[PDB]
Structure formats: structure tokens, C-alpha cells
Design a protein around this ligand. Sequence first.
Ligand SMILES: NC(=O)c1ccc[n+]([C@@H]2O[C@H](COP(=O)([O-])OP(=O)(O)OC[C@H]3O[C@@H](n4cnc5c(N)ncnc54)[C@H](OP(=O)(O)O)[C@@H]3O)[C@@H](O)[C@H]2O)c1
Ligand SMILES: NC(=O)c1ccc[n+]([C@@H]2O[C@H](COP(=O)([O-])OP(=O)(O)OC[C@H]3O[C@@H](n4cnc5c(N)ncnc54)[C@H](OP(=O)(O)O)[C@@H]3O)[C@@H](O)[C@H]2O)c1
Ligand SMILES: O=c1ccn([C@H]2C[C@H](O)[C@@H](COP(=O)(O)O)O2)c(=O)[nH]1
Ligand SMILES: O=c1ccn([C@H]2C[C@H](O)[C@@H](COP(=O)(O)O)O2)c(=O)[nH]1
Lengths: 514, 492
Amino acid sequence: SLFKIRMPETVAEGTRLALRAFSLVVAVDERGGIGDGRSIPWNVPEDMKFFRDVTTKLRGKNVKPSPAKRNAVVMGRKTWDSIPPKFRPLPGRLNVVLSSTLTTQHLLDGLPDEEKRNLHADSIVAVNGGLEQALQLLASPNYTPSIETVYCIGGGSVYAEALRPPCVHLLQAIYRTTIRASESSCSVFFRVPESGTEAAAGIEWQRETISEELTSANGNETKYYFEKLIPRNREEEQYLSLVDRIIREGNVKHDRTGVGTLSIFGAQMRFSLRNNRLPLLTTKRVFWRGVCEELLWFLRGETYAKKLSDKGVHIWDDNGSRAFLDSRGLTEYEEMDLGPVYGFQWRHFGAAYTHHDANYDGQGVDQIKAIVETLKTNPDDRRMLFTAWNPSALPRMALPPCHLLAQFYVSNGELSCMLYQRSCDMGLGVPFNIASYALLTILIAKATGLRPGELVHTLGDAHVYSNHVEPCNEQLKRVPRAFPYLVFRREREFLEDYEEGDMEVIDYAPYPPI
Amino acid sequence: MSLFKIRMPETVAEGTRLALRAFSLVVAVDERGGIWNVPEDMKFFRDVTTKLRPSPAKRNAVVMGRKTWDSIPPKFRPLPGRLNVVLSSTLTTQHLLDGLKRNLHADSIVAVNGGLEQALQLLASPNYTPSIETVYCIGGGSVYAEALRPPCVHLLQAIYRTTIRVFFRVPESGTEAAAGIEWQRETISEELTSANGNETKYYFEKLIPRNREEEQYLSLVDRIIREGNVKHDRTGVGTLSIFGAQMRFSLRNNRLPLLTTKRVFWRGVCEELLWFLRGETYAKKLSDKGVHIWDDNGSRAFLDSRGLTEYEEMDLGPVYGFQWRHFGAAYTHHDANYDGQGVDQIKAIVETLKTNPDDRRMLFTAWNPSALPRMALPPCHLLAQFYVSNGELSCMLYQRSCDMGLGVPFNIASYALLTILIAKATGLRPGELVHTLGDAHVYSNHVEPCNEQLKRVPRAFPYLVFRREREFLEDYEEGDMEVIDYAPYPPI
Ligand SMILES: NC(=O)c1ccc[n+]([C@@H]2O[C@H](COP(=O)([O-])OP(=O)(O)OC[C@H]3O[C@@H](n4cnc5c(N)ncnc54)[C@H](OP(=O)(O)O)[C@@H]3O)[C@@H](O)[C@H]2O)c1
Ligand SMILES: NC(=O)c1ccc[n+]([C@@H]2O[C@H](COP(=O)([O-])OP(=O)(O)OC[C@H]3O[C@@H](n4cnc5c(N)ncnc54)[C@H](OP(=O)(O)O)[C@@H]3O)[C@@H](O)[C@H]2O)c1
Ligand SMILES: O=c1ccn([C@H]2C[C@H](O)[C@@H](COP(=O)(O)O)O2)c(=O)[nH]1
Ligand SMILES: O=c1ccn([C@H]2C[C@H](O)[C@@H](COP(=O)(O)O)O2)c(=O)[nH]1
């Protein structure tokens, strides 16, 4: 306990979600109009179907909406009133209504009968505020992470709030149907701000998809099309442009097997960790549970990989086997005893390692505890770094450290981190390490009374394996989506006590397998 | 009588009405950025907020929270020479005055029942715009917080921060909190020592939002000087030039790209543009307004040097605006009646803009090879094309020959105005100006001054507001509009 890092009284502060991320669904005419102030002056059943499916369906396969896992739909009072009483609430979704007039009971009182009220009791909530207040409520443990995706559907006032800060920064996707008509009957309008405009607040909107022009079977042959707009993700673009550079200009190298590689030397990337943001790459899914479990394992100063494999994390299995250890001369280590790797050096630098069973408390230099104490007392210190690169210990490690050094910096109450990585597998390793040092920085922020800032990633030998070239090249076609967020469901007394189940990654919508 | 003019729609003032007025911020912080009697800071505070570039017709405004008003020791309040704007949900302007002396300071205080935004709405109204030169936010924590977030942050022209040795935080560039704004220091002072007890250490900072649009211009001036080809003209006048460039300028939200690193003669810009739109050719209509830009090209001597021997002084022939409104019409003299003569390109564009926004032929030219020999000067800005997106009107200007020092900033302003006026005539909001340059040059005599101007950090652009409207486009007068919050650098 004396050797552990005690979390400050402000643990959940500076990590708590202010607003839940959301997507937006809207239909417009070509003049950008949405309604007359009361209803919608066109009828395209095909769009009503799309609206239903996009807001109703969960991500993935064979899904079933439920009280424990469902989508939420946020609307204004006038939008609620525009739904015919028999068709409301919107089935299979949590209906969040914004209103200063009506309470949650008032909304139920507007339902035809008691049977409908008793049944749909759990599926209707009133918020006395705007969309921001709703996102604050949907950021609550009761709703986060039970609600998979929030959808704003909400009408001009709510749309306007959605497209302006602070809410627009939480907007992951705009699903926009355009009706080919110029309706004069429209009094309410909708517009998305353009790339370099003041109103865009630094967001660059671009289309992921646009459909062909379609014809409605509504009797009027009305033309319409679909668009999905997403906020340009320049941070993931860094990683993609590096991959592309490696393919096009990288030197051919061969590793310690004769396995071919394309590589460059010297690169740098940056990622915002502010306001719960988590740089998990979207163009290819990251094994977050592995990232999380292993980072905690590092932080504890652990060396027994069986603690990972017992948790279904098999990333170290091949490097912990009898055959592999033996091939490094480590004939005395039991299987899965990796030696004094990584987090052992973080917590116990220079300590004399023999086996994982030994008790290393207070042995070596605890670099992480030293950093935490410095951060809370003199955050402007320029020596706040730790290393796993220990030439004295290297020969007795299963693997020499890859991500080998990290340095901290503080500005405006924000903690930033620079990672140094000597050898960077772009296809699989790099996205994993970005997620890993994002988590670390967030946890150190919580341990020190600071808000998370930025992750800087310095790469040495950045490379793409021979068999990754073609997959990675097809991945380059994908337009990066908005990043997920990290949320803590509970806290701990000590940093070392944190569990993978204490936190949840929300609003992670990566592209399917290549 | 007015059948050949362009009638404005009912929605004239809608697309150019000022929602919020621009402002600057003054704050004193400790070494941790938090929130004590440094007289030099008080003198600075007074000088910045009080001084004009002061009367009930021409003064600065100061916006403050209620408790900041409370913390000003009575008799120092109201702050002299400034309109005092106090934000309060509890106190009216009568209440504030009751706390005071009275009578003569009635015209000096106003309570606003709301936040900074609501106060900026009020100051944007004709009563306080442009009668108030600069708005200063000095108000407490809650007011500063509102100042450094949208919508208000988009109207913040400068931050004057004294650091002396609730937290005041300027969002770092690239941050979501920054909202696309890049804050940077125009100036930072040496660490100064106060004259008092304790020998207090303190320094001044002036932070400004990076003007990347004016940087295009300065980046081009720089490239022309460092890399431009040398030419000496028919008179032996030296020039440095490059060929082919392009700049963009936003016109949204009343924004006016008047360059700040070197003052632009706005009044001349505006009078001349209106003169173009009217199809005018008699430059004496401008000189009789104190705009003398065409004098050296309208004189008998110059006219004769172009062999234009039958034109009376200041009659320039079928130049510019004549081609805009009467393309290909036969020109005799300026006083002749040209109604219905030639092709009215402006009116055709206006009608197309309202009926078929996506048309790709919405352009006009002054480049008329048939009429060039009869012009005092061939057109420099010779083609403009229009474009509509998201209810916004955009414009592309083509300029064959571009004097970077004096001509170019003038023409940016000129076509900025044009686009604003055409949007008003067509039911659209101003979008973007795109400016294509041909032979872009800096004169030998401008190299040194231009090089010094390059040291100056571009400031935030001013705004154009319309004080009154007109029934016809051609009826617009320079007095109908005002440029607000234009704070250019002094002479080179
Ligand atoms: N084309 C489309 O895809 C689409 C989709 C949805 C809606 N619409 C149309 O949009 C029109 C309605 O839009 P609208 O903007 O006028 O109304 P609205 O957005 O639908 O609802 C506004 C109402 O929401 C409540 N509200 C919103 N913000 C609030 C806040 N900050 N604090 C407290 N309460 C708040 C207020 O309820 P109280 O009055 O009770 O205080 C307010 O009157 C209708 O014609 C509808 O058909 C179109
Ligand atoms: N170091 C510096 O440069 C500096 C500059 C200014 C102030 N300060 C200090 O800070 C102290 C006060 O700071 P503060 O944080 O309390 O801010 P404040 O200046 O006192 O502003 C808060 C007050 O302004 C009014 N207000 C603000 N926003 C409003 C809105 N949205 N709608 C209606 N009313 C609104 C409210 O007045 P009502 O309660 O009457 O409704 C509110 O109580 C002062 O004592 C001063 O000494 C320091
Ligand atoms: O954390 C890690 C660990 C290994 N890698 C990859 C990078 C390299 O291709 C191999 C390590 O091989 P080595 O020869 O030890 O540098 O694994 C990674 O990208 N991130
Ligand atoms: O609107 C204008 C008109 C003239 N200029 C400058 C550009 C050229 O240096 C001269 C015209 O001389 P010229 O030889 O016709 O290109 O004036 C300008 O920059 N903007």
C-alpha cells in the first residue's frame, strides 16, 4: 500500500464526461428548409424508412434493441408533437424530449391509454434544457454506456444547437437526406458550416458517402438522395499518410527471420486527449481490451504474462513459450516469465530480477511514482520521464522494449506525453501503442490532478511488413471517422488497483475488416 | 426613368445586419493565470480603454459584470470618458445610477439584462454603431469565460493581458476550445518593475487572432521581393514580378477584408465601386467627392497622350463600368444618354442569380478589344464570375496586372464590396472573394517600405454595416454604409 500510488481527492474530476457524443439525422429541401414550424411539407416514405433504420439499428450483427443496450433519440417539444400520438414514442429507442413546459409525466399524459403509459414508461424522458443539457444527462452512468448511439432529430432549434459549440465538437456524423424540391412553405432552415468558416469552429465537414439520385414511389416521382457527412479526422490522416509514404518511398529491410519490410526512419505524430477523447484508429479496429489489460499490467510492474493470457489476452504467448525463452538463453525462466521487461523497469528500474514470484516492492527506482510526485508539486520540471531501455537488463528480457521512453509536460493544467518508440509496426503495433499511451496519460492525469492534454508519438524505424502492404494499401481508401471517448464507470483508491472493467470506450465506430 | 436600374428585393438588410459587435479584452492575471495595486497597470488600463485612434458621439465602451462595477470605488465610477455597460439581471440602469454624480452621467451608463453576447447585440445596434469606436470587455470571470467561447470569441479582436508577480485561459491553437482560432502575440514586453512597495515584477502581452487571409498577401509580397523577376518598363521604371497567384477572403458575418498592415483608402474604394456599378465614365464625379485616384489619367495632357483628343477633361471613355452596364455600346461623350444601350451584364447576372443559382455563365467582363483604344486606360480588374452555395454568393476576380503595394489591397476591398452588394440585390448572404492575379509586381520604390511592412503582424479584419438601404442598387451612396473596428498599423 505504501508502495502504491494513491489517487487524489479529485480523481473523477477532469475525467468526467461533460457531454455524450452524438449523430444527427435530417431531411432538407434544396433551399435547406426542414419544416414550416409545425410539420414537414413533403412525404418520402423511403426517407422515413432510412430514418427508422439508422436510428433503430445497433452496430454489427444479429442485434436486438433493449433497455440495457439501445439507441437514444433527442428531439424538441414541437418535434414530439408532430409525431402522431399512436406512433409515439419512437419504438425501440429512448425518446429524449427537450421542453420547459412539459415534464416526463406530461408526455405520458399525452398518450392515448394507461396500457401505453405502463409499457413505454422506460422509453421516455423529458429534459428541462437544450441539447447540451440532454447530452449532460445522456453522459450520466444511467445512460452511458447503456445508450450505444445518441441521435439528434430534434428540429430547427435543436439542430442549431447541435451545429454550434460546445455541442458540435461532440457531433460524430450527419446523416442528411436532400429532397429535390424548392418548398416555399419552409420557414425553418438547416445548414452545415463550411470548411474554413468562423461558424465551422475548426471542423472540416466532408462526405463519407453520397447515394445516386433516387426516385420515390410516393406517387409524385419525387427525387432525393442520401449523404453521410463526417468531421475530417486529421490526426488519423497523419498515420495514413505515413503508411502511404512507407509504401511509396520506404527502403526494403529484412527482420530477424528474413521477413521483408518497407521502412522509413524518423516521424512524429500528435493526438488530442482532451475532454475524454481517445485516439483509437477507425480505419481498422484496435484490440482495446488487450491495450487496456496490458497497460494496467505495465503500470503494476508485472512480468508474468500468464496474468494476461488468463484474461484472454494472448499477445505475449509466443514470447513467453519454453522454446522462445530457451532461444534467448533464458533457460531458467518458467513459461510466461518474460524477465524484467517494460513495466518492471518503469516501477523497479535496475532491480535484480530472478523470477516473477519474488516481491519487488521498493526495489529499484520507481520512475512512475517519482513522476506523479513531481507533477503534483513542480509540474514545470523538465526531467519527468521514464525508461524501459536498461542495457544492463536487456539480455535477461524476453524482448527488448519497443516503446522505450515517455516524457511529461504540463501547460494550462493539462498533462501532455511524448512517447519514444524505436521500432514501429504500422499495420498492427502502432495503433495499439497510440491507444496504450493515451490510456497511460489519462491515468497519470487522474493521479496528479491534471486534465489530459496531448499525446506526441515519435517513431524511429517505422515499417510495414511485406504481407501488410496490400491490406494497408486498401485501408488508405477509407476516410477516417471521428475518434471514440474514454469514460470511467468507477474509480479506485490506488492507481495499481484499476481494472479493465472500471472504464468503457464509447462511440467507437470503426470500419469493418478489410 | 428607373426601368434600366436594378430593384433590390424586400430582403435587403437581412443578409448584412450585424448580429454582434466586435470587441477587445483587457485583463490582469497572476503568474498562475488566476483572477494588486500596480499603478503602471492602472495607467495602461485607463489609456487602452479611454483613448481613440472623446464625446457622447465618439467614445469607447467598457463592458463589465455587476460585481466588477461593485468593486470600482464610488466616484471612480462611472469610468470617465467611456460608456459603461454593466451586465446585471438584478440591477437596471436606474439602480446603478441610484448607487452614485447623477444627472450628467446618465448618458454614460447602461445596464444590460443578459451576458456579453446580449451586450454585444445592443452595441451592434445603430445607436451605438459606429458612434462607439472600440468595445472593451473588462468584466469578471463569468464575462471573460463568455468572451473566450463561441459565439463571442469570433468577435474578439485583441487580448491585452498584464501578468503580475478563477483562472484566465486562452485556448491553444488546434484545440477544440480554440474553435479554429489561432491566438498569437503581437507584442510581449520586458519584465518591468513597479514603483511601489515590494518592487512588483510585471509584463504586458497583446494577443491577437492570426489573420491567415492577410498572410496570403504578405507571403506573396515576400516571394515577389525574394524571388521575383526584374523588369524596367517603357519609361524605365523598375519592378519585381511573379506570374499567376490566387487568394481567398471570407465575406461572411459582415467581414470586410481591408488590409491592416497598411491602411486602405476605403472611402475612395467605395465611391469608385458605386461609380462603376452606375456605368459612369466621368471621373469628375469622383474628384468632386475628394477622390482623386483618376486625376492623373483624366487630365487633358494624359488624354492627349492616348490620342483621346475629343474627350473633355475627366471623360475617360467607355472604361470599366460602361462595359459592365453597356457592353459594346458606341461611346461619344460622358453626358450622352446610354439607357438600354449595349449589354447590361450586371442586371443579367442579378436576374440569373435569383432564378438559376447553379448557372456557370454568371460573369461579366470589361475587356472589350473593340473599345480598348477609346479608353483612357485598359481595364486592370477585367473579369468577375459569380457562384452560389449554401445560400451564399461567391465571386472570382481576374486581374491582369497587380501592384501589390497600392493597387491590390484597393481591389480586394473593391470586389469585396461588389460581392456584398450583389448578394443584397439577389437575396443571398456574402460568401467568399477569390482573387486571381496575373502579373503581380512590386515597384522598385516600394521594395524597402514593403519589406518593413512584412514585419507587421496582420490584425483581425474590420466589418461593413449598412446604416440605410435603397430601392435600387445604383442609388447606393458611400454614406449608406460604415466600416467598423478597422485598426490598421500607422504609416510606413
Ligand atoms: N426535416 C426534418 O428532418 C425535420 C426533423 C425534425 C423536425 N422538423 C421540423 O422542425 C419544426 C420544428 O422545429 P422548431 O425548432 O421550431 O421546434 P423544435 O426544435 O422541434 O422544438 C423546440 C422546443 O424544444 C424545447 N427546447 C429547445 N431548446 C430548449 C432549451 N434551450 N431550453 C428549454 N427548452 C428547449 C422548447 O420546448 P417548450 O416550448 O415546451 O419550452 C422549444 O419550444 C417542425 O416543423 C418539424 O416538423 C424537421
Ligand atoms: N484581475 C482583473 O483584471 C479583474 C477584472 C474584473 C474583475 N475582477 C475581479 O473579480 C470580481 C468579480 O468577478 P466575477 O467572476 O464575480 O464576475 P462579475 O464581473 O462580477 O460578473 C458576474 C455578475 O455579472 C452579471 N452577469 C454576468 N453574466 C450575466 C448574464 N449571463 N446574464 C445576466 N447577468 C449576468 C451578474 O450580475 P447580477 O448578480 O446583478 O445579476 C453576475 O452576478 C470583482 O470583484 C473584481 O475585483 C478582476
Ligand atoms: O509495442 C510494440 C512491440 C513490437 N512492435 C513491433 C515492431 C517490430 O516490427 C517488432 C519488434 O521487432 P524488433 O526486432 O525487436 O524491433 O514488433 C510494435 O510495433 N509495437
Ligand atoms: O486596379 C488596379 C489598377 C492598376 N493597378 C496597377 C498595376 C500596374 O502596375 C499599373 C497599371 O499599369 P499597366 O501597364 O497598364 O499594367 O497599375 C492595380 O494594381 N490595380
